[PDB]
Design an enzyme around this catalytic site. Structure first.
Site, short mmCIF file in Angstrom:
data_model
loop_
_atom_site.label_atom_id
_atom_site.label_comp_id
_atom_site.label_asym_id
_atom_site.label_seq_id
_atom_site.Cartn_x
_atom_site.Cartn_y
_atom_site.Cartn_z
N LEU A 281 -56.79 -54.41 -13.03
CA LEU A 281 -56.44 -53.51 -14.06
C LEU A 281 -57.65 -53.24 -14.95
O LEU A 281 -58.54 -54.06 -15.06
CB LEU A 281 -55.27 -54.02 -14.89
N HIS A 282 -57.65 -52.03 -15.52
CA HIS A 282 -58.75 -51.56 -16.36
C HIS A 282 -58.25 -50.51 -17.31
O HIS A 282 -57.48 -49.66 -16.93
CB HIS A 282 -59.86 -51.00 -15.47
N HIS A 295 -50.78 -54.02 -4.35
CA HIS A 295 -50.94 -54.28 -2.91
C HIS A 295 -49.61 -54.21 -2.17
O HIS A 295 -49.59 -54.57 -1.00
CB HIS A 295 -51.69 -55.60 -2.66
C1 LIG Z 1 -55.53 -60.51 -2.72
N1 LIG Z 1 -56.07 -60.68 -4.06
C2 LIG Z 1 -55.05 -60.44 -5.07
C3 LIG Z 1 -57.33 -61.00 -4.38
O1 LIG Z 1 -57.69 -61.04 -5.55
C4 LIG Z 1 -58.30 -61.36 -3.29
C5 LIG Z 1 -59.68 -60.76 -3.59
C6 LIG Z 1 -60.79 -61.80 -3.74
C7 LIG Z 1 -60.31 -63.00 -4.51
C8 LIG Z 1 -59.12 -63.51 -4.21
C9 LIG Z 1 -58.29 -62.88 -3.13
N2 LIG Z 1 -56.93 -63.39 -3.19
C10 LIG Z 1 -56.04 -63.27 -2.21
O2 LIG Z 1 -56.30 -62.73 -1.14
O3 LIG Z 1 -54.69 -63.76 -2.46
C11 LIG Z 1 -53.59 -63.50 -1.58
C12 LIG Z 1 -53.46 -64.65 -0.63
C13 LIG Z 1 -53.98 -64.57 0.66
C14 LIG Z 1 -53.87 -65.65 1.53
C15 LIG Z 1 -53.23 -66.82 1.11
C16 LIG Z 1 -53.10 -68.02 1.99
O4 LIG Z 1 -53.51 -69.07 1.52
N3 LIG Z 1 -52.58 -68.03 3.22
C17 LIG Z 1 -52.01 -66.88 3.89
C18 LIG Z 1 -50.75 -67.32 4.62
O5 LIG Z 1 -49.90 -67.95 3.67
P1 LIG Z 1 -48.31 -68.10 3.92
O6 LIG Z 1 -47.89 -66.78 4.52
O7 LIG Z 1 -48.23 -69.28 4.86
O8 LIG Z 1 -47.73 -68.36 2.55
C19 LIG Z 1 -52.73 -66.89 -0.19
C20 LIG Z 1 -52.84 -65.81 -1.05
#
Ligand SMILES: CN(C)C(=O)[C@H]1CCC=C[C@H]1NC(=O)OCc1ccc(C(=O)NCCOP(=O)(O)O)cc1
Length: 319
Positions: A281-282, A295
């Site tokens: 957000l901004h 998302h």
């Molecule tokens: C997606 N997002 C909001 C981000 O900020 C990105 C960008 C760079 C910094 C952090 C990133 N965070 C993120 O991708 O969070 C979503 C997420 C993705 C994968 C996971 C994970 O640990 N495993 C994926 C499978 O998990 P389950 O389906 O088993 O629960 C958890 C959260």
């Protein structure tokens, strides 16, 4: 905890991993497309599997027309930009990139990679979020492993995410490390313009950390500053201050933006979103209008907040 449910208006869609909403000094609005972000969301662990190079888009806010400004890649390695801020002295964007480190991107689409390595001489890690202090020093989160050509990894399960300060003398100083996926980042300033506190989201751990800032790349008194509610997959992503120094934080997966008062602690209020995954957000400069990336629909929306945003560095005067 009080909750408000303001009206959200959709501005555009079909932007994979939509993030880095930012306004430049001319009031033009840009957003970042991130195939890797979207992929990490859809995967069941190690999967991230070669992704396309994300790019930076200009978005017309009347018409919704998207224009690709820049699709950064260096040496075959597509960039994964994730967070943007506009410089003050000159009109250029500073872009944190999870594959390429810190970029400076011009409006005509040329860009420079700022650091192969840090000042101690260690390799650079992939960067995600950044915030200028009013001195012009850029504080940066780095949740990824090494920049390309290292294999891509992110500290979502283990502690290896770092914090940097890129100083006004062009030094990239590692200031802390062993975070589990440091995400949004902000600088709390005193009313007299002095930088005071650095706030860093640690995403999956549902925590916001603070440090006291005593100068360029000089922080101490590391403490847990805020608690993020909910047990959902996700946690705090992007964050921004309002003019009263309340901190608004996208709580990805919770359907809420959290609002913290100046002393942190527990949220004082929550903002219910019409989607589960607010990401970043901004504020529109000199307005109460907040642009939010999301998302569920890979979209950008806007809503009106109760007061104006805090000035970014780009809005302050060289005088
Ligand atoms: C997606 N997002 C909001 C981000 O900020 C990105 C960008 C760079 C910094 C952090 C990133 N965070 C993120 O991708 O969070 C979503 C997420 C993705 C994968 C996971 C994970 O640990 N495993 C994926 C499978 O998990 P389950 O389906 O088993 O629960 C958890 C959260």
């Amino acid at each position: 905890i009080p909750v408000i449910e303001p009206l959200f208006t959709k501005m555009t869609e079909d932007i994979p991993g939509a993030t880095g909403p930012v306004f430049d000094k001319n009031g033009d609005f840009y957003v970042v497309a991130s195939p890797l972000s979207e992929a990490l969301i859809n995967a069941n662990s190690l999967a991230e599997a070669r992704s396309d190079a994300g790019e930076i888009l200009h978005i017309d806010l009347k018409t919704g027309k998207k224009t690709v400004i820049c699709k950064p890649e260096v040496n075959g390695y597509g960039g994964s930009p994730i967070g943007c801020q506009c410089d003050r002295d000159a009109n250029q964007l500073f872009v944190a990139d999870m594959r390429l480190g810190l970029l400076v991107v011009q409006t005509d689409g040329t860009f420079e990679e700022i650091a192969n390595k840090d000042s101690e001489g260690r390799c650079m890690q992939g960067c995600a979020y950044c915030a200028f202090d009013y001195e012009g020093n850029l504080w940066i989160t780095a949740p990824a492993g090494g920049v390309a050509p290292a294999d891509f990894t992110i500290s979502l399960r283990e502690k290896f995410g770092s914090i940097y300060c890129f100083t006004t003398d062009g030094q990239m100083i590692q200031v802390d490390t062993a975070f589990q996926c440091p995400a949004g980042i902000a600088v709390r300033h005193m009313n007299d313009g002095r930088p005071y506190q650095l706030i860093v989201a640690e995403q999956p751990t549902k925590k916001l950390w603070s440090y006291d800032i005593k100068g360029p790349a000089n922080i101490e008194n590391k403490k847990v500053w805020g608690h993020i509610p909910g047990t959902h997959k996700g946690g705090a992503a992007g964050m921004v201050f309002d003019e009263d120094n309340n901190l608004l934080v996208a709580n990805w997966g919770s359907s809420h933006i959290e609002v913290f008062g100046p002393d942190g602690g527990q949220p004082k209020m929550r903002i219910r979103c019409p989607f589960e995954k607010p990401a970043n957000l901004h504020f529109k400069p000199q307005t109460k209008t907040i642009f939010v990336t999301e998302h569920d629909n890979n979209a950008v929306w806007k809503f009106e907040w109760q007061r104006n945003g805090k000035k970014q560095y780009c809005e302050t005067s060289k005088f």
